[PDB]
């Protein structure tokens, strides 16, 4: 049983008011059953697209979530992950730079 690593980064340079894409890359987990949400100001974003689940040479799973977003300096963004390996959801906030 292995704990998911979470990385949150933007497709294009984050400029306030310009539409962009936010990525949440979740890796190094086992078993494969996992729940992944992306959050804007703590609330679940509805239209989040998901890649097919796959796995690496070391057999650990990975998956990529993404959604449209427009960064501003009044909005936070996060990726929240529920998985058997952790007692509660793990949330990683977007760094605002990544």
């Amino acid at each position: 049983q292995k704990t998911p690593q979470i990385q949150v980064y933007s497709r294009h340079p984050p400029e306030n008011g310009k539409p962009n894409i936010l990525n949440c890359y979740v890796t190094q987990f086992h078993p494969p059953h996992i729940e992944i949400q992306m959050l804007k100001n703590g609330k679940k974003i509805p239209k989040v697209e998901m890649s097919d689940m796959s796995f690496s040479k070391d057999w650990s799973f990975y998956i990529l979530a993404h959604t449209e977003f427009t960064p501003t300096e009044t909005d936070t963004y996060a990726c929240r992950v529920k998985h058997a390996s952790m007692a509660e959801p793990k949330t990683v906030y977007w760094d605002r730079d990544m």
Binding site: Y9, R11, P31, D52, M53, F55, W59, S60
Partner: protein, 264 residues
């Protein structure tokens, strides 16, 4: 040097619930998807059929269809036989395909996240350290001559031939060039150079002062974008004041020899 990988993931939750899902990669591009939901293998590219005719493709698909049902049945029946010593839930993963050179093939299987079985030569075999209760089922599997013959054909012959067809039919996607965009951001201070949207994967990203490479540059992991391009960052730890004069330099095949230089 392209590696073709068919990745199968099977979760068995209890005697009444399981699913098997597959994805197929040529290098770092997904060529196929096969969901438990679907009877047919879905194409994730317009060239995912390679050079195979419609009927040849249909034959190959049919065999995998039969396989998927047989595999699920075999695993369930094996668990009944071993019960209660081997208990649900069970995760099985298969990684199979071929690495093309100017080829070699592999078929690796893992149980609960650990590599346990391969096909090699003419037979299935447990790997050193695998649980000993696998030995009997593998011996029985090895008695099945038709399966052994089919697997040998698939690995030795079908895989390399299929893949040479994919390399031809997918040439413009496989050889696509996508230009990165870069940007900078940041006791000491950590300077971050972000590089996103590049394809193919090979890239060079360095903090510079004039023409001098700053050896403290720490390259991060390659992270995928959702549009089949790559993301990477390179960080440099500096003290205050020092930030003047520094730049991030990016080289990539798509840039026609015109590097990106970003001055802090």
């Amino acid at each position: 040097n392209y590696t073709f990988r068919c990745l199968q993931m099977s979760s068995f939750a209890n005697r009444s619930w399981s699913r098997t899902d597959s994805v197929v990669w040529l290098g770092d591009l997904q060529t196929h998807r096969w969901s438990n939901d679907s009877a047919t293998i879905s194409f994730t590219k317009p060239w995912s059929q390679g050079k195979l005719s419609n009927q040849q493709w249909e034959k190959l698909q049919h065999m995998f269809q039969v396989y998927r049902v047989s595999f699920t049945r075999d695993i369930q029946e094996l668990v009944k036989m071993m019960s209660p010593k081997e208990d649900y839930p069970i995760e099985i993963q298969l990684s199979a395909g071929c690495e093309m050179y100017p080829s070699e093939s592999f078929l690796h299987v893992a149980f609960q996240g650990k590599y346990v079985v391969r096909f090699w030569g003419t037979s299935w075999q447990t790997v050193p350290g695998a649980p000993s209760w696998l030995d009997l089922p593998i011996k029985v599997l090895n008695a099945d001559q038709g399966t052994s013959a089919t697997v040998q054909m698939l690995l030795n012959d079908t895989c390399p031939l299929f893949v040479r067809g994919l390399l031809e039919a997918g040439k413009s996607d496989l050889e696509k060039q996508e230009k990165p965009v870069a940007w900078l951001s940041s006791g000491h201070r950590q300077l971050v150079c972000h590089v996103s949207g590049f394809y193919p994967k090979p890239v060079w990203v360095m903090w510079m002062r004039g023409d001098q490479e700053q050896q403290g540059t720490h390259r991060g992991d390659f992270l995928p974008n959702a549009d089949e391009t790559w993301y990477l960052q390179a960080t440099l730890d500096v003290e205050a004041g020092e930030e003047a004069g520094l730049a991030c330099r990016v080289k990539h095949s798509s840039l026609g020899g015109q590097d990106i230089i970003l001055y802090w």
